[PDB]
Amino acid sequence: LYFQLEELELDEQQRKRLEAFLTQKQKVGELKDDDFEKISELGAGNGGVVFKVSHKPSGLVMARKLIHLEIKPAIRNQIIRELQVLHECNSPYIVGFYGAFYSDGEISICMEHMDGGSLDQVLKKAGRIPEQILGKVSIAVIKGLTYLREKHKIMHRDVKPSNILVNSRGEIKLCDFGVSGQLIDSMGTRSYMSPERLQGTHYSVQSDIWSMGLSLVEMAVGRYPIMAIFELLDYIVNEPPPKLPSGVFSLEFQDFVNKCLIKNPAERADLKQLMVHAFIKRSDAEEVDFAGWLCSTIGLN
Ligand SMILES: Nc1ncnc2c1ncn2[C@@H]1O[C@H](COP(=O)(O)OP(=O)(O)NP(=O)(O)O)[C@@H](O)[C@H]1O
Ligand SMILES: O=C1N=CCc2nc(-c3ccc(I)cc3)cn21
Ligand SMILES: [Mg+2]
């Protein structure tokens, strides 16, 4: 293989893992319904359901997300066409993609199976995720958001613990970002939307920053930090943002989440500021055995 991964920084471990995934992907060509065998259900959200499957031609285990959309065949063909751009999203912080196709009123998004599941699933088992672990998660999210913005000019639009995936090798990656404008158009009482997004305002990277801030507060405290549908959104829009409890969390992490949750999107931190925040600088220097922690608290082999 003739890798063109020079644009990425990549340490040796990151390079070896990304090349190993892209090498396995070479076993995968055109994707068809008949070529899959369902193993189990990974989870289900609002948009669809995701299955752990076996791709029979390649022998690869994959995560297959199915989204029910039996609409005008021309508009769904544009969705599928736009989803092919996921073939160009190669990053240590973005879940690997195999292909997207349509069959029997369902669009399938086939991706790399992340054996540690999502952070909302690990949150259930862990109770609360330690600050040191959230440090590495925060790095992964900022770096993934940066890659999507700089390289493909795409905003995530769906940052939350269920869209942050982990594995036994200690990798933290984003999935379910807004790569297809038509999929967004053609498409809970726990909301991660920024106060300006809930009011109407055009999507900005600042809206993903808020979403990340709220997700970190929930993972650190073990509960959604804000019930009745309108009551919940009225609190996000009209009441002060939540804060981390003092004493239990360092001043750097409290300042980091505070900067993400600033109601004013102009005052709110941007990715460049967050990458050089003291919480990130501190977390980057720390030696945190993320894989050891993940495997021991969720019982992964
Ligand atoms: N690649 C994957 N590998 C392993 N588990 C996955 C993968 N993709 C998704 N999952 C799991 O499947 C669950 C359901 O995913 P999903 O249907 O996207 O619901 P959601 O994340 O809760 N909502 P949304 O992202 O807004 O559509 C997730 O919460 C993950 O636990
Ligand atoms: O925008 C969206 N709306 C609804 C569902 C959905 N799934 C994705 C997606 C899935 C895997 C990967 I990797 C990247 C993007 C985007 N998306
Ligand atoms: Mg999801």
Side-chain angles (χ1 to χ4, degrees), residues 57-122:
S58 68
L60 265 58
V61 173
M62 293 176 49
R64 178 188 183 189
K65 168 185 249 170
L66 293 106
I67 300 134
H68 193 90
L69 275 184
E70 228 297 318
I71 56 179
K72 282 95 161 69
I75 61 189
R76 55 114 160 123
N77 286 335
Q78 184 195 326
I79 291 173
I80 287 137
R81 174 203 92 196
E82 288 166 358
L83 291 173
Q84 306 307 314
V85 169
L86 285 169
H87 281 302
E88 204 143 329
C89 307
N90 311 305
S91 168
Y93 312 99
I94 301 298
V95 170
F97 170 79
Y98 294 108
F101 69 95
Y102 171 86
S103 177
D104 238 338
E106 313 269 347
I107 104 95
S108 280
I109 296 168
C110 297
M111 58 202 138
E112 183 191 3
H113 171 248
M114 294 293 287
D115 67 4
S118 58
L119 285 190
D120 84 286
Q121 298 171 320
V122 354

Side-chain angles (χ1 to χ4, degrees), residues 82-255:
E82 288 166 358
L83 291 173
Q84 306 307 314
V85 169
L86 285 169
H87 281 302
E88 204 143 329
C89 307
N90 311 305
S91 168
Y93 312 99
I94 301 298
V95 170
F97 170 79
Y98 294 108
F101 69 95
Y102 171 86
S103 177
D104 238 338
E106 313 269 347
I107 104 95
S108 280
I109 296 168
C110 297
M111 58 202 138
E112 183 191 3
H113 171 248
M114 294 293 287
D115 67 4
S118 58
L119 285 190
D120 84 286
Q121 298 171 320
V122 354
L123 190 62
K124 270 188 162 280
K125 284 215 123 284
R128 267 175 279 124
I129 295 178
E131 186 179 323
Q132 279 195 301
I133 299 293
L134 295 167
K136 300 304 184 179
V137 171
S138 298
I139 296 165
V141 181
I142 292 160
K143 289 192 178 164
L145 251 6
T146 303
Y147 171 81
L148 291 175
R149 190 196 111 90
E150 291 308 282
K151 302 268 174 61
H152 308 280
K153 281 81 198 294
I154 44 199
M155 283 160 288
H156 187 113
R157 311 177 127 89
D158 202 14
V159 182
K160 60 188 174 177
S162 69
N163 288 343
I164 310 172
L165 267 26
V166 300
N167 70 19
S168 49
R169 286 159 244 143
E171 297 181 281
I172 308 150
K173 303 176 176 195
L174 298 164
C175 68
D176 301 346
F177 42 93
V179 62
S180 175
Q182 192 46 247
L183 216 208
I184 296 153
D185 297 359
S186 300
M187 293 262 277
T189 313
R190 270 186 160 108
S191 180
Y192 304 83
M193 277 176 158
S194 67
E196 66 278 9
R197 174 110 280 233
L198 290 175
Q199 298 176 120
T201 308
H202 287 277
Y203 211 87
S204 170
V205 293
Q206 295 307 102
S207 196
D208 297 317
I209 292 321
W210 162 283
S211 296
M212 189 190 67
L214 196 75
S215 296
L216 288 167
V217 174
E218 172 179 2
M219 295 180 289
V221 164
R223 75 156 187 104
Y224 180 69
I226 312 137
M227 223 194 217
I229 310 131
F230 170 76
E231 182 187 352
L232 197 111
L233 306 176
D234 204 23
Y235 199 94
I236 296 164
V237 178
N238 293 309
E239 285 304 300
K243 293 201 156 209
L244 237 31
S246 187
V248 39
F249 298 102
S250 69
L251 296 182
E252 298 88 276
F253 187 34
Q254 290 176 57
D255 192 67

Side-chain angles (χ1 to χ4, degrees), residues 23-84:
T23 300
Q24 298 306 286
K25 187 151 141 63
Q26 290 298 287
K27 300 170 180 177
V28 181
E30 94 267 317
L31 296 176
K32 285 134 72 91
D33 189 58
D34 46 79
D35 294 328
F36 296 95
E37 196 179 87
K38 178 181 152 188
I39 302 163
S40 62
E41 179 161 332
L42 287 166
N46 289 301
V49 53
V50 8
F51 297 136
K52 182 166 116 164
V53 296
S54 182
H55 178 246
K56 294 182 259 213
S58 68
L60 265 58
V61 173
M62 293 176 49
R64 178 188 183 189
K65 168 185 249 170
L66 293 106
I67 300 134
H68 193 90
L69 275 184
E70 228 297 318
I71 56 179
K72 282 95 161 69
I75 61 189
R76 55 114 160 123
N77 286 335
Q78 184 195 326
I79 291 173
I80 287 137
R81 174 203 92 196
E82 288 166 358
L83 291 173
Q84 306 307 314

